[PDB]
Write a protein that binds this ligand. Structure first.
Ligand code: HEM
Length: 78
């Protein structure tokens, strides 16, 4: 599911950064970190595909669908 994707079914693995908050990556169950961001999954996924700050571009490494499933999973902890 989205959890599987987020934890291990991603390359690079989202967990590795977001679990700890590497380079200030918006963490899980941390609504404040997301409040300011365009929380809309459909927007967040673009940021994810393109890359943001330390986050590399995902375009090709993870499909929008994969990403979406991971992102909604991330957001569901907030
Ligand atoms: C794994 C595929 C993965 C997902 C999914 C993911 C999502 C994600 C979102 C939705 C954001 C916010 C986008 C926005 O602000 O519009 C976000 C932000 C950051 N991430 Fe991420 N992220 C995934 C993976 C990784 C990896 C592997 C790293 C560490 C190199 C990482 C880091 C960050 C950082 C830093 C940001 C934003 C920093 C900023 O400038 O605000 N993410 N991620």
């Amino acid at each position: 599911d989205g959890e599987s994707i987020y934890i291990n079914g991603t390359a690079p693995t989202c967990s590795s950064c977001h679990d700890r908050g590497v380079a200030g990556a918006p963490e899980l169950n941390a609504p404040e970190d997301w409040a300011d961001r365009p929380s809309s999954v459909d927007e967040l996924v673009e940021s994810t595909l393109a890359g943001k700050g330390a986050m590399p571009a995902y375009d090709g490494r993870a499909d929008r669908e994969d990403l979406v499933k991971a992102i909604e999973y991330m957001l569901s902890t907030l």
